[PDB]
Ligand binder design. Structure first.
Ligand code: CL
Ligand code: CL
Ligand code: CL
Ligand code: CL
Ligand code: NA
Length: 129
């Protein structure tokens, strides 16, 4: 599924990301836009042989099992395909774990480069939240 911006905002809010580890919802919507273009089905292979999956481009080196990233971890205890579902529950739960890990939302390159330090409230403008 390709979410609309506010549609994704609402989904992320219902699933508990708004202000999760102090990151207001706009940060998460912004990260998703630039991580996946709001596309739950997005995948992108990394140089190290891991892949990123889903709306929040969660990586198979540490977070999910995709069966083809040797000596990786699966800290979210999920198959990476779970992160591609139209339903973003698994992605959000895994996102919570990642952001909790020490590095905050710096774990998402798109968030560091395109959302950190920007007016992220803009991403939830207009939304009925
Ligand atoms: Cl698995
Ligand atoms: Cl959802
Ligand atoms: Cl933080
Ligand atoms: Cl915000
Ligand atoms: Na893995």
């Amino acid at each position: 599924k390709v979410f609309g911006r506010c549609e994704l905002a609402a989904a992320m809010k219902r699933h508990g990301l708004d202000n999760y580890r102090g990151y207001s919802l706009g940060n998460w919507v912004c990260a998703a836009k630039f991580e996946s273009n709001f596309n739950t089905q997005a995948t992108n292979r990394n140089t190290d042989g891991s892949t990123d999956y889903g709306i929040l481009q969660i990586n198979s080196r540490w977070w999910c099992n995709d069966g083809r990233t040797p000596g990786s971890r699966n800290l979210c205890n999920i198959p990476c395909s779970a992160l591609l579902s139209s339903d973003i529950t698994a992605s959000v739960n895994c996102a919570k774990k990642i952001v909790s890990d020490g590095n905050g939302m710096n774990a998402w390159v798109a968030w560091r480069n395109r959302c950190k330090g920007t007016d992220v409230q803009a991403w939830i403008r207009g939304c009925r939240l």
